[PDB]
């Protein structure tokens, strides 16, 4: 996951 | 004999107003706000623009609240010392008589031009709407009447737009106190009517005496020269391009679509990955979608170059 | 002498003559040509005189109240709440008149 | 008939007029109108050229010629400067002209009348 | 039959030149440089502008050094493979024949316009001198020649028209620039594809007017509207004002005279104080000469406001 | 004064 990722 | 509208404009403009003649250059607006703000039955005051070719004096008009006894008004104002060198002496207000309406040129009544003036008219109505904090439905209501209630050919092909132009113009005379035909604003109706007391007439447009291909050709040519000699002064936006930096920012704003208050998704290629902030997506694009960003960078530059090229190659579809 | 150097406005006829000589004069024809050149000459004249005009009038009360704006010495030029009222009255009169078909038959006269 | 101002395709003055005619309820036989809408059409085209510019650039950007014409970026080893060879070429064309000027080649010269 | 000048142009353009037809879009300039930079008796190559309405193919013209065997040249180039898809086959260069000179509009010959163009022609001569690193006296030499050596012949513009045609002709022959279409070209032959017969002038009938007054009034009025609707977009400099901060900085840049390297003098009224740097003076001005600065920043603000007031009062000296 | 020469 990357910065701020919200799966 | 003055028209109903001109005669009515005249009476309105003078009603519950006093003239104050010989207003000196040294007299300030603050001095006048002192003298008059204290008085309750004064609603507004107007000051003519100085005209030095004639002389140093202006005119001051005091507009009183409706149903003001104008003997009391004089009594209430007469004797007021604005400064040592000027004591107020009111008198009944005047407007130049026995004049002919000022003729507006042929060209103002032509298809092309009339419609330009229409866009300007609308814009001046909206300006006046914001400036004087009025309703924003003036142009709306005017055109609604003009459509619904017709008026009796003897008419040009331009009639609908002239009628409307004429009335948008008349709205600005009465409400804004703007003389569209001179682009002078005024502080009151009486002030405006000093310069256009009979209003304006229109010179009729002759489809025969129309004579402008040559002026288009020249215009376009001089515009081309500018692209080569003064590119920095040319309206890039008008030509459907942007400064590289600006173009690239507009691509980032478009692809970082806001799903919720604190949810911002990537829309670059098939990518639909979400983020909890707008600037969280802006990092993503830098890392993964380099290829795409290079492309945008290249397009931004080339697009700038292209539009500034007088005789560039052109899409076949955009010629006959 | 060159009008494009001088602070004073040269008449359209006196201008023609300077131009005739300056560029080596039927006037008849020139009259119909230099209408635009004279407009641009005046535009230019106005422009370079502009600063001098301000320099002399900047301390006169009439000129300051028009143009002098500065938030540091409380010199704003807002629209008075008094005036806003005055305009809304003129608005409302106009729309009452509109709705009573006052302006149904209105149009600028012809010349 | 549809709005040319929305369409990416160009439209003959004759066809533009007809749209204008119906769009603004003008009872005029196109040659009645021919002189009026010269400017309007010109701006219609300017406006078209404008909003189609980006799409043209996008489709041609990777072609060799288009890159050579417009693509500049020191950072990706692309620029446009006048070749030392061309300066030489142009200088000889100058010197011919001035030799011709001085030898009276252009004393009788003038653009013919129509 | 072709004029000497057009016939000569033709021969000059083709002399020691080879045509390469059917040049594909994918073919880069870098490719062509590789192929020809080595060949010493080649001086220039010139690629045509793609014309996609007609065809996806340009034309490449190879220009050889003076006194070149144009069989040695064909042989030296023929068989060069620029890429897999296009190998070079040289052909004798062509220019479209049996054409009528492209007529220029009447307005180009009118005095007001003829003079604008004259100023634009000079600006393109000077642009060509910097771009192509040529002499800067081309303009002077052409004018001095015509002043000295007269012609055997006529309108009232003649002196200008004559000069304009030669200034236009200079650009054609030297900077390969078609002033009339604002197209730059890479070689004489390339230009002469679109103007092989050159151009002609349609005569100016002074009797014919296009309501010059009307287009002016309308122009002036629109310029006036812009002052109110789009002041930010208006060219303040042209109207004899400066944005406030710039105006002020230009004044300080006058009253600050640097006397050596770290010696800066204040020339405001009866002052002669010296400072290390100019910004040390700019402070001194603010501390000591406040009164003077207060006045400058006042005058800058009003001058801005003034020039943007469409119906401002004006010096009687600048009317009639 | 500040940065003033003598
Ligand atoms: Zn993504
Ligand atoms: Zn000092």
Contacts of B280-283 with C-beta under 8 Å, sequence gap 24+, read: B280/A2, B280/A3, B280/A4, B280/A5, B281/A4, B281/B255, B281/B256, B282/B252, B282/B256, B283/A2, B283/A3
Q: How far apart are CA B37 and CA B44, in angstroms?
A: 9
For residue B103, the Cα-to-chain-centroid distance in whole angstroms is 22
Determine how many CB atoms are found less than 10 A away from the CB of residue B170: 21
Helices (H), B101-155: 111-131, 138-148
Q: How far apart are CA B74 and CA B90, in angstroms?
A: 6
Which chains lie within 8 Å of chain C at 3 or more CB pairs, if any?
B, E
| Centre of ligand 2 from the C-alpha of residue E282, in Å | 9
Taking ligand 1, which is a single-atom ion, which protein residues have CB atoms under 5 Å away? Answer: B 266, 268, 271, 284
In the numeric block, which tokens belong to residue D22? 């119906």
Q: How far apart are CA E16 and CA E68, in angstroms?
A: 7
The SS3 call for residue E241 is coil
Q: How far apart are CA E90 and CA B235, in angstroms?
A: 43
| Centre of ligand 2 from the C-alpha of residue B217, in Å | 56
Nearest residue of chain B to residue D31 (CA atoms): B207
Q: How far apart are CA E93 and CA E82, in angstroms?
A: 20
- Contact between B245 and B231 under an 8 Å Cβ cutoff? The reply is no
Is there contact between B and D if contact means ≥3 C-beta pairs under 8 Å? yes
| Burial grade of E147 (CB within 10 A; 0-12, 13-18, 19 or more) | exposed
C108–chain B Cβ distance below 8 A for any pair: yes
B157/D9 touch (CB, cutoff 8 Å), yes or no: no
Q: How far apart are CA C57 and CA C61, in angstroms?
A: 9
Pairing of strands B17-23, B90-91: antiparallel
Q: E-strand spans in chain E?
A: 17-23, 42-47, 58-64, 81-83, 86-87, 102-104, 177-178, 183-184, 199-201, 256-258, 264-266, 274-275
Instruction: Select from E247, E251, E233 the least CA-distant residue to E303.
Output: E247
The DSSP H or E segment spanning B75 is helix B70-77
The DSSP H or E segment spanning E220 is helix E212-229
Determine how many CB atoms are found less than 10 A away from the CB of residue D50: 15
Candidates D38, D82, D110, partner chain E, best to mutate (most E CBs within 10 A): D110
For residue E275, the Cα-to-chain-centroid distance in whole angstroms is 44
Q: How far apart are CA B212 and CA B206, in angstroms?
A: 14
In the numeric block, which tokens belong to residue B117? 């003036």
Residue ranges matching CATH 3.30.70 in chain E: 15-87
Of C62, C95, C108, the CB nearest to B166: C108
- Contact between B197 and B10 under an 8 Å Cβ cutoff? The reply is yes
Contacts of E287-292 with C-beta under 8 Å, sequence gap 24+, read: E287/F1, E292/E268
Pairing of strands B200-202, B102-104: parallel
Alpha-carbon torsion (D84, D86, D87, D91), positive or negative: positive
At how many Å resolution was this determined? 2.8
- Contact between C83 and B173 under an 8 Å Cβ cutoff? The reply is no
Candidates B2, B3, B5, partner chain C, best to mutate (most C CBs within 10 A): B5
Q: How far apart are CA B78 and CA B73, in angstroms?
A: 8
Q: Which CATH number fits domain B14-91: 1.10.260.40, 3.30.70.330, 3.30.160.340, 3.40.50.720?
A: 3.30.70.330
At a CB cut-off of 8 Å and minimum separation 6, what does C17 contact? Answer: C25, C27
Please give the CATH number for the structural domain made up of E15-87.
3.30.70
Looking at the DSSP assignment, which residues form a beta bridge with residue B20?
Answer: B60, B90
Instruction: Select from C82, E163, C51 the least CA-distant residue to B29.
Output: C82
* Alpha-carbon distance values, B66 to B44, B135, B192 (Å): 12, 22, 21
Q: Which ligand is nearest to the CA of B272?
A: 1
- Contact between B106 and B204 under an 8 Å Cβ cutoff? The reply is yes
Instruction: Select from B271, B312, B197 the least CA-distant residue to D57.
Output: B312
Torsion of CA D34, D38, D43, D46, to 10 degrees: 100
Residue ranges matching CATH 3.30.70.330 in chain B: 14-91
DSSP E163-175: HHHHHHHHHHHSS
C63/E240 touch (CB, cutoff 8 Å), yes or no: no
Residues 204-223 of B with CB under 8 A from E: 211-215, 217-218, 221-222
Nearest residue of chain C to residue B136 (CA atoms): C91
Nearest residue of chain B to residue E120 (CA atoms): B225
Determine how many CB atoms are found less than 10 A away from the CB of residue B65: 16
The DSSP H or E segment spanning B185 is strand B184-185
């Amino acid at each position: 996951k990357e910065d701020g990722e919200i799966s | 004999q003055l028209s109903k509208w001109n005669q009515d404009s005249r009476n309105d403009a003078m009603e519950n107003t006093l003239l104050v003649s010989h207003v000196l250059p040294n007299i300030s607006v603050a001095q006048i706000h002192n003298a008059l703000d204290g008085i309750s039955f004064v609603q507004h005051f107007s000051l003519s623009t100085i005209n030095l070719i004639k002389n140093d004096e202006r005119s001051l008009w005091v507009h009183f609240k409706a149903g003001t006894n104008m003997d009391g008004a004089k009594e209430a104002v007469d004797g007021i010392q604005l400064d040592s060198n000027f004591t107020i002496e009111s008198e009944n207000p005047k407007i130049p008589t026995h004049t002919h309406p000022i003729p507006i040129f042929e060209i103002a009544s032509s298809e092309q031009t009339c419609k330009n003036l229409l866009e300007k008219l609308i814009r001046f109505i909206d300006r006046a709407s914001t400036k004087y904090s009025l309703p924003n439905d003036a142009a709306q209501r005017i055109e609604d009447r003009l459509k619904t209630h017709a008026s009796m050919d003897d008419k040009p092909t331009n009639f609908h737009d002239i009628r409307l132009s004429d009335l948008y113009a008349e709205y600005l005379r009465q409400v804004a106190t703007f003389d569209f035909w001179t682009s002078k604003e005024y502080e009151s109706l009486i002030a405006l009517l000093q310069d256009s007391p009979a209003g304006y007439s229109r010179k009729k447009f002759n489809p025969s005496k129309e004579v402008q291909e040559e002026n288009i050709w020249l215009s376009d040519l001089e515009n081309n020269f500018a692209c080569l000699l003064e590119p920095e002064n040319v309206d890039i936006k008008a030509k459907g391009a942007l400064p590289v930096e600006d173009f690239i920012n507009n691509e980032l704003d478009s692809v970082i679509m806001k799903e919720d208050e604190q949810k911002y998704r990537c829309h670059v290629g098939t990518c639909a990955k979400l983020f909890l902030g707008p600037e969280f997506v802006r990092k993503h694009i830098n890392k993964k979608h380099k290829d795409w960003l290079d492309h945008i960078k290249k397009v931004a530059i080339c697009l700038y170059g292209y539009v500034l090229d007088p005789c560039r190659a052109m899409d076949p579809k955009v010629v006959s | 002498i060159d009008p494009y150097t001088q602070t004073n406005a040269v008449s359209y006829e006196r201008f023609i003559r300077w131009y005739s000589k300056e560029n080596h004069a039927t006037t008849e024809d020139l009259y119909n040509s230099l209408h635009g050149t004279y407009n641009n000459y005046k535009q230019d004249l106005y422009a370079r005189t502009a600063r001098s005009f301000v320099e002399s009038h900047c301390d006169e009360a009439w000129f300051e109240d028009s143009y002098w704006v500065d938030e540091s010495q409380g010199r704003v030029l807002e629209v008075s709440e008094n005036e806003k009222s005055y305009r809304r009255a003129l608005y409302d009169k106009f729309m009452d008149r509109l709705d009573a078909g006052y302006y149904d038959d209105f149009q600028l006269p012809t010349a």
